[PDB]
Every structure is written in structure tokens, then in C-alpha cells.
């Protein structure tokens, strides 16, 4: 898993910023309770099911937790125009330090 060749739409700086965010809200996985805390600190808490739905959207290996690759997939979906307006994932991407739409 080389995120640098898989996610060519993000600069190395963007990917490293995404990694800094990932490591912070962290074994290398962000589970539901970790995602809950992250949305709380960001100022936008989500419901239990809202968090589960955020994970489900990018959980490509179906273990109900987010690897770094799947975290990057959130930003890929955001930058591809695939997230629903004001969805939990849209809100995470917006409130992160990371601008992907320009
Ligand atoms: Ca997963």
C-alpha cells in the first residue's frame, strides 16, 4: 500500500497532513469510538448511527474501523464530488485542515 501512487490527486503535503490528522485521533486504526472523539473535538458531534454510516461509506475491508488508506478515501470522495452535502463525511473533510476542492 503506497498512498503516494494510489492517491495521485493529493500532494505529498496533503497526504502527510491527512496522516497527521489520522495519527492524532487514533495500531493504525480509527474505530467508532475514536471517530466519535474526533468529531467531538472538531466541534461537530455525530450520532452513533451517523458515525457508523461515515465508516461504512469508506470501510473497504469491512472491519468496521478506518485504516489510513480508508481515511484517505474520505478525502478522495470529497475531491471527486461524491459526498452528500452536509453529511458526516462532508463535515469531517471541511473541518479538517485540508482543502481538497481547489
Ligand atoms: Ca476498515
Author numbering: 80 to 105, 109 to 184
Which sentences from the paper describe this structure?
EFhd2 and EFhd1 consist of a disordered N-terminal region followed by two EF-hands and a coiled-coil domain at the C-terminus. We also reported previously that the EF-hands of EFhd2 are involved directly in F-actin bundling in a Ca2+-dependent manner and the coiled-coil domain is essential to the F-actin bundling activity by homodimerisation.
Although the crystal structures of EF-hand mutants (CDEFhd2EF1 and CDEFhd2EF2) are similar to Ca2+-bound CDEFhd2, we observed structural flexibility in the Ca2+-binding loop of EF1 and the C-terminal linker. Furthermore, comparison of the crystallographic B-factors between Ca2+-bound and EF-hand mutant structures showed that the largest changes in B-factor values were for CDEFhd2EF1 (35.6 Å2), CDEFhd2 (20.4 Å2) and CDEFhd2EF2 (21.5 Å2). To evaluate the effect of Ca2+ on structural dynamics of EFhd2 at the atomic level, we performed ensemble refinement for CDEFhd2, CDEFhd2EF1 and CDEFhd2EF2 using Phenix.ensemble refinement. In addition, CDEFhd2EF2 also showed a moderate degree of mobility. Consistent with a previous study showing that thermostability of EFhd2 was restored by Ca2+ at a high temperature, the half aggregation temperature for both EF-hand mutants that bind only one Ca2+ is significantly lower (CDEFhd2EF1: 62.32 ± 0.14 °C, CDEFhd2EF2: 57.90 ± 0.60 °C) than the two Ca2+-bound EFhd2 (CDEFhd2: 84.89 ± 0.01 °C) and is consistent with ref. Even depletion of one Ca2+ site in a two Ca2+-binding protein showed a dramatic reduction in F-actin bundling activity to a level that is similar to that of previously reported data for a two Ca2+-depleted state26.
